[PDB]
């Protein structure tokens, strides 16, 4: 029993983290085989950052301008190239700790584990969801740029996020490992704001099933609703529409608990319209939307 925000074990990724220094700018890189991937922001100085022309900045660099340190071992850079908002630094040594890996791009509503790092050294691990507005609510300080997000499946690490920046609201933005930003953001120190965000309805329902599996049942009712009538309510509360595919994905949790998906929707409708009236669900006084159906199944009894 129990339900916690749980990250994947980080060791496979820890063995891949390095420090990249260009001039006085330092950040983290990801060393897989004979390539180190890092944010192209490493080539900017403080003043370059308002309006950097990265192609210009890069053509003025050579391999020797990049110092890559893996623990107490300096790696010699023997080539460099830019791919979108990441740099690929070819090094003379293949990382002996490279795990099986993929570069995947995730969807809004999906979760992943973040290994926060500073100076190439891992400092903490936590779970994040990609919000509907393509930001993440992380915990990152200066020096964290280049920290990565990932999921693990059967010892294959699927890297999905590289951290770049913090927006004025305190949320975070970054790229996939091909260097393409999630969302309408750019790697420069300008006023940028995310679109209005929405609540991930299917994940709230998944977490309500986790709660039932864990013995929290007070929010259940003998009522039901239609999908159409539910979405009419969800729209008023700034929840994403719930699709038939979402209903299907919740099938296994519905089967395990005996609570039809549309019945749980009726419970959520009542929670939205009434609030919690002083009670908690799985230790929270708010409706939690950062657990996917997979996260619930992975963690909850069968």
């Amino acid at each position: 029993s129990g339900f916690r925000k749980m990250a994947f074990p980080s060791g496979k990724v820890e063995g891949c983290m390095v420090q990249v220094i260009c001039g006085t700018t330092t950040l983290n890189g990801l060393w897989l085989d004979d390539v180190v991937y890092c944010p192209r922001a490493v080539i900017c100085t403080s003043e370059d950052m308002l309006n950097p022309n990265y192609e210009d900045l890069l053509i003025r660099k050579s391999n020797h301008n990049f110092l890559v340190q893996a623990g107490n071992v300096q790696l010699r850079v023997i080539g460099h190239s830019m791919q979108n908002c990441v740099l690929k630094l070819k090094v003379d040594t293949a990382n002996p700790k490279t795990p099986k890996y993929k570069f995947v791009r995730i969807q809004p509503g999906q979760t992943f584990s973040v290994l926060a790092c500073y100076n190439g050294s891992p400092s903490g691990v936590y779970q994040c969801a990609m919000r509907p507005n393509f930001t993440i609510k992380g915990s990152f300080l200066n020096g964290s740029c280049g920290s990565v997000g990932f999921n693990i499946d059967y010892d294959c690490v699927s890297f999905c996020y590289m951290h770049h920046m913090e927006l004025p609201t305190g949320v975070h933005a970054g790229t996939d490992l091909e260097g393409n930003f999630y969302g309408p953001f750019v790697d420069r120190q300008t006023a940028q704001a995310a679109g209005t965000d929405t609540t991930i309805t299917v994940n709230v329902l998944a977490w309500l099933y986790a709660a039932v599996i864990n013995g929290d049942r007070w929010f259940l009712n003998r009522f039901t609703t239609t999908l159409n009538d539910f979405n009419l309510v969800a729209m008023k509360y700034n929840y994403e529409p719930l699709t038939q595919d979402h209903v299907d994905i919740l099938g296994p949790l519905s089967a395990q608990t005996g609570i039809a998906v549309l019945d749980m929707c009726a419970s959520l409708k009542e929670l939205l319209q009434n609030g919690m009236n002083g009670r908690t669900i799985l230790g929270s006084a708010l409706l939690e939307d950062e657990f996917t159906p997979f996260d619930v199944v992975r963690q909850c009894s069968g």
């Binding site: 700018t25 922001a41 950052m49 740029c145 004025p168 006023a191």
Partner: peptide, 10 residues
């Protein structure tokens, strides 16, 4: 306020 590229200084 502007976005911040969260690199470090050294």
């Amino acid at each position: 306020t502007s976005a911040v590229l969260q690199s470090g200084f050294r």
